[PDB]
Amino acid sequence: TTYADFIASGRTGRRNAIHD
Amino acid sequence: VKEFLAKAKEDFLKKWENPAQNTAHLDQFERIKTLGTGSFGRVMLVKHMETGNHYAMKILDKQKVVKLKQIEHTLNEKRILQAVNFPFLVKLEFSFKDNSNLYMVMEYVPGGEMFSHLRRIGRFSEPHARFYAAQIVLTFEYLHSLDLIYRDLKPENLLIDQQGYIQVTDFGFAKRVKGRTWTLCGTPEYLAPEIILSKGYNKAVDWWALGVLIYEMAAGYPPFFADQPIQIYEKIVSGKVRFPSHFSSDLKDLLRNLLQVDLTKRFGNLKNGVNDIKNHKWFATTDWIAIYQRKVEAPFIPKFKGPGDTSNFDDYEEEEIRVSINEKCGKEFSEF
Ligand SMILES: N[C@H](COc1cncc(/C=C/c2ccncc2)c1)Cc1c[nH]c2ccccc12
């Protein structure tokens, strides 16, 4: 399930901003 | 509304043109605990001795800010924060600087990040997501009316207060602009196609981020994710979006228009402005005035055993605050 794929991804923690 | 905004702009402008400066000293606060850490700064819980109040103090290392070329963005943040005032914006109480750091003391929101709550519970119901989303709608209406673009919307930057309402924080990317801007900034999952394509953008990017926020709040995961930013950016510009089975027909409709890759018809950036959003089916039951007054029943009240409590916040390695005996970047930060 998409829920499962999300929890298994490396993007469930606090996401950092970008610029450079 | 138009009546409210008009007067709001008057107060903001006076402050914007004559920013308060150096309204406190480091030695007037007691260091309690670190609440977050970033590349050029950190946020700590502190206790103000005179009043016995607890505050969140954002400390930025001037040298690291310069290395990361965020000087102007930092000046933008403070100048804007000391001038705004809205029920859903965390209040800046004091600001000052010393030889090494810049300091911004804000009101403490013990409830914690929406992020933490959202992840623990999985997803919020639609009435729940609608309650929070409505607060962002009015906040963006407010900010934009002042020619301010937020550019940093995400669950990580939303705090939940004692009344259960949201408090937006982190104005690191906020900027006052009329017309287009070009800085590549934000968070991968939340970037509008215009930003990734590097082609001059306006406040429409905030409304797009609202689209991402609502989806994540209601689904439990963002509409666009993958382990590599590139991979995430490919999905955002594709013009493709999948919606969970439980999403209501209206919600899917509100999101199709918000996550519109064609910013020349994306809700919020149309002739009707924000009203295309406020008068949409999914918000039919929302009493916008009730939300601003905070007279609506909150879907959840965070708990705390007392002021100063930090259990709604993660633990972070406690590092020491040093201040060199030599001024570091005076000129660059003179107006702060
Ligand atoms: N995302 C964390 C916290 O970020 C911020 C940023 N600005 C204001 C608050 C405000 C937090 C807060 C907490 C409780 N009550 C009131 C306000 C929190 C680390 C982080 C990412 N970029 C940063 C840049 C500078 C310092 C830290 C970070």
Q: Enumerate the known binding-site residues of B.
A: 35-43, 58, 107-113, 154-157
Q: Which of B122, B186, B219 sits opposite A18 (nearest CB)?
A: B186
Ligand 1 binding pocket (C-beta < 6 A) is A 14; B 35-38, 41-43, 56, 58, 90, 106, 108-109, 156, 159, 169-170, 172
Determination approach: X-ray
Q: Which atom number of ligand 1 is nearest to the Cα of residue B104?
A: 8
Cβ-based interface (< 8 Å): residues of B facing A:
38-39, 68-70, 115, 119, 122, 152, 154, 156, 172-173, 183-189, 219-221, 225-227, 229, 242, 244
Domains, chain B, with CATH or none:
1-18+113-303 (1.10.510.10), 19-112+304-334 (3.30.200.20)
Nearest to B323 by CA among B104, B102, B100: B100
Return residues 1-20 of A near B (CB < 8 Å). Answer: 2-3, 6, 9-12, 14-20
Q: How many CA atoms lie within 13 A of B167 on its CB side?
A: 18
Mutate which of B169, B171, B173, B314 for ligand 1 pocket (most atoms within 8 A of beta carbon): B169
Per residue, the 3-state secondary structure of chain B, as one string, reads: CHHHHHHHHHHHHHHHHCCCCCCCCHHHEEEEEEEEECCCEEEEEEEECCCCEEEEEEEEEHHHHHHCCCHHHHHHHHHHHCCCCCCCECCEEEEEECCCEEEEEEECCCCCEHHHHHHHHCCCCHHHHHHHHHHHHHHHHHHHHCCEECCCCCHHHEEECCCCCEEECCCCCCEECCCCECCCCECHHHCCHHHHCCCCECCHHHHHHHHHHHHHHHHCCCCCCCCCHHHHHHHHHHCCCCCCCCCCHHHHHHHHHHCCCCCCCCCCCCCCCCHHHHCCHHHCCCCHHHHHHCCCCCCCCCCCCCCCCCCCCCCCCCCCCCCCCCCCCCHHHCCC
User: CA of B205: how far to CAs of A11, B209, B212, B231, B292, in Å?
Assistant: 22, 6, 11, 20, 23
In this structure, are residues B33 and B104 in contact, taking their beta carbons and an 8 Å threshold? no
Of B40, B58, B67, B185, which is best to mutate to test ligand 1, by the most ligand atoms within 8 angstroms of its C-beta?
Answer: B58
Cα(A13)–Cα(B291) distance, integer angstroms:
30
> At how many Å resolution was this determined?
1.9
* Centre of ligand 1 from the C-alpha of residue B169, in Å: 7
